[PDB]
């Protein structure tokens, strides 16, 4: 009767390739996520995640290179500092920290991406729908 709406932000060099690897190996995972491509996770900022929640996202996922393996040397270090602040801001706004998930997944980590998608889906399914859009539409 209800399925979570999850949005994803993946870097073109590692997590995007990691998601492609999962696909080449037919590594099945739940169909709630919709991925958006960026060149680096350093492109990800609070405005894109908060905009996703405003639009109705039940969960937001972000994927970047391993710390130290960014294709652009240090874009993921800036995103890491931004996401830690964002986790606590979401809690101040009544949004469960668990509705945001950020992971470091390489282009060769298809199995890890599959399990991260399964775990995040199960986590959001258990939390139920985020009632922000419903509260704003009143």
């Amino acid at each position: 009767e209800w399925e979570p709406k999850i949005i994803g932000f993946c870097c073109n060099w590692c997590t995007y390739g990691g998601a492609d690897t999962a696909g080449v190996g037919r590594m099945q995972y739940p169909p709630s996520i919709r991925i958006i491509r960026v060149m680096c996770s350093g492109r990800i900022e609070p405005s894109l995640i908060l905009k996703a929640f405003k639009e109705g996202a039940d969960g937001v996922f972000v994927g970047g290179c391993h710390l130290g393996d960014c294709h652009y040397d240090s874009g993921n270090y800036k995103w890491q500092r931004r996401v830690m602040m964002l986790y606590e801001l979401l809690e101040e706004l009544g949004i469960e920290k668990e509705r945001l998930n950020h992971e470091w997944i390489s282009a060769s980590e298809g199995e890890k991406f599959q399990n991260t998608m399964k775990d995040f889906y199960n986590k959001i399914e258990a939390l139920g729908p985020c009632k922000l859009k419903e509260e704003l539409d009143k």
């Binding site: 609070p46 830690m84 009143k138």
Partner: protein, 297 residues
């Protein structure tokens, strides 16, 4: 030229800034025909055929909603007058609580309040809307004058342009342009984050580089940057530039990016979130209702 004004969920400060035109107010009033303005005249109903309308404040109750819709039908051009009307303003912080919590405090739990039956006013008073909303969220807004309140010259410039038939144009840059504080040519780098009362700030150096949360980087210019000039950080009362939707989100993005940039790979990403105990109040003082997430669930 028939002009009208009204106020909604604001504080009257935008109307007072209009009066701060002083001698120029009389020159303005001789050119325009003021047909409705509760603070200055007794015309009770908004008349038909209004050419320009200045609407102060955001939407806080059902009456504000009706008036906004009525002014929209009677006026050709509608202007969101001030930061409250444009972004929601300080009253927007009420969105961090339920209406029942705001009302129970004011009419029951305040230390001096004596309410025997425990009732909330409900007779001949309007109900509050679910959350404070900027004017554009309920009606079509043609233009807007940002500022808490907007400087008197900017108000005259916008109105004067509309009387001439020209399209009004607001300044586009961020506050560091107008701010007289000296910046490091190497770039901005933040070592630690301090609250406004911690330490003694240097009067020449950029307050953001000193470790204070200054909203000037994420705020539109026009005010003349009187706050940093006076010794305190900008609070972002003019709102964001035209290229930024969520001011707080962008301010957080900038602050997090430069925090410990000289030691980027080793700086602890938990120092900043741990050092800021009031995040919404630090980044959304005047714009929470216009943010992507404008309420606390």
């Amino acid at each position: 030229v028939k002009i009208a004004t009204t106020w909604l969920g604001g504080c009257s400060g935008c109307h007072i800034s209009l009066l701060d035109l002083h001698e120029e107010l009389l020159n303005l009033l001789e050119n325009v025909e003021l047909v409705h303005c509760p603070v200055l005249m007794d015309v009770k109903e908004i008349p038909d055929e209004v050419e320009v309308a200045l609407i102060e404040g955001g939407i806080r109750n059902e009456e504000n909603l009706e008036i906004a819709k009525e002014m929209r039908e009677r006026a050709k051009i509608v202007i969101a007058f001030g930061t409250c009307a444009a972004f929601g303003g300080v009253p927007g912080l009420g969105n961090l609580y339920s209406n029942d919590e705001l009302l129970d405090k004011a009419y029951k739990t305040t230390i001096t309040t004596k309410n025997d039956d425990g009732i909330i006013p409900n007779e001949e008073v309007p109900e509050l809307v679910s959350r404070v909303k900027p004017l554009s969220e309920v009606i079509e807004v043609d233009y807007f004058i940002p500022g808490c309140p907007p400087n008197p010259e900017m108000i005259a410039e916008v109105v004067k342009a509309l009387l001439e038939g020209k399209e009004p144009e607001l300044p586009k840059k961020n506050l560091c342009e107008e701010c007289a504080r000296k910046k490091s040519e190497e770039g901005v780098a933040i070592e630690t984050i301090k609250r406004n009362y911690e330490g003694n700030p240097d009067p020449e150096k950029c307050l953001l580089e000193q470790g204070y949360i200054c909203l000037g980087i994420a705020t539109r210019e026009g005010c003349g940057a009187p706050c940093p000039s006076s010794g305190v950080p900008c609070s972002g009362c003019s709102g964001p530039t035209d290229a930024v939707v969520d001011q707080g989100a962008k301010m957080i993005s900038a602050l997090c990016s430069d925090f410990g940039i000289d030691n980027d790979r080793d700086v602890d990403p938990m120092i900043l979130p741990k050092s800021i105990k009031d995040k919404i109040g630090s980044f959304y003082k005047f714009t929470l209702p216009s943010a992507f997430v404008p309420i606390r669930l």
